[PDB]
C-alpha cells in the first residue's frame, strides 16, 4: 500500500510513456492495479484527469533532477558533462520517454502542459547558465544556453529510441563522443 | 488495387502520425478512404502490415529530402542555409510526427525500425559533410557535422510538439532564426 491514488498514477506514467494518451485505455490502467474500471472513479473523475496528474508527476521528477544538480556540481566546464548525462540518462528512463509522449496530449488541454514545458525549459536554461564562463567560452551566454538546450533536445528522442530498441550502451557511447565535440566547439583554446 | 493500396498507406500515415499505432483503428483507416473495412484486407492482412508499410513510406519521404538536395545543391554556404531552411519549413508535419510516433510502436513489432532511424541519421550526416569547407567554417569537420545534426535532430521534437502546443509555422520561423544565429558564429565565409 498504502495509497491507491498514487499506485494508479505510478502505473499510469508507465502505460502513458509506452503507448501515449490515445493508446492507453482506462482498462489498461485498471488492470495494472487489479481493480475494476469503475473503481478508478474512486480516485479520479476521468482518463484526462489521470493523465494530467501523471504529467505533473513527470515534470516534478524532471524539475527535481535540475534542482538537485547544485548538491552535486562545482559548475566547472568539467561538471557540465555529468549534468547533461544525468538529465538524458536518468536512472528512471520512463520520465524522458513520457516527456516525448507529451506530443500526443489531447490538443484539448495543451495549455497547461505547454506552460510546464516552458517552465522546465526556463529552469534548464538557468542551470546551464551557471556553467557559463565568459573568459573560457567563445560565444555569448545566450548562445551557449541555446546551443546546450538544442543539444539536449536532440537527445530526448535519441535516448528514448535507444531505450525502446535496447541499444542503450551504444547510445551512451555516442553521447559521450558528442559532448566531447560540444565542449570543443564552444571552449576557447 | 495498387492505387488503393497507395491511398490507404498515405491516409494511414496521417492517422498514425496523429494517434500512433494503438490509438489508430482499422475502422479509422477505412473511413479515411471511404471503403468498407473488409476492403482493407484486399490489400493488407492486418493493422500491423499497414503500419509497417506506412513507416517505410515515411522513411522513403524523409530520405528523399537528401536525394533532392544532391540533385540541385552546389554545396556552398548559401546552399547550406537553404538546406537548413528546407529541412525546417518543407518537411511536411505528418512525417515528422510519424517519426516521433515510432516511440509507441508495440514491442512485438519493433521490426527494422531502429535500423531505419539510424540509417536516416547516417545519411543526413554524410550529406551534411559535403557542405564542409575548410576556408569558410571555423570548425573541424567532426564538429561541423555534429552541430548541423543537432539542429536537424532537435527539430523533430519541436515540430511534433508545435502541432499540439501553439503554431507549426511560427515554430519553423523561430527555430530557423535560432539555428541561423548559432551557425553564423562559425562562419569566416
Ligand atoms: Cl479505491
Ligand atoms: Cl545530437
Ligand atoms: Cl521566416
UniProtKB/Swiss-Prot annotation, chains A, B:
Pfam family, any one: TetR_C_37
DNA-binding region location: 25-44
Protein name: Biofilm operon icaADBC HTH-type negative transcriptional regulator IcaR
GO molecular function terms listed in the Swiss-Prot or TrEMBL record: DNA binding
Keyword Transferase in record: no
Family annotation (SUPFAM superfamilies): Homeodomain-like
Gene assigned in the entry: icaR
Upper taxonomic lineage: Bacteria, Bacillati, Bacillota, Bacilli, Bacillales
Oligomer and partners: Homodimer.
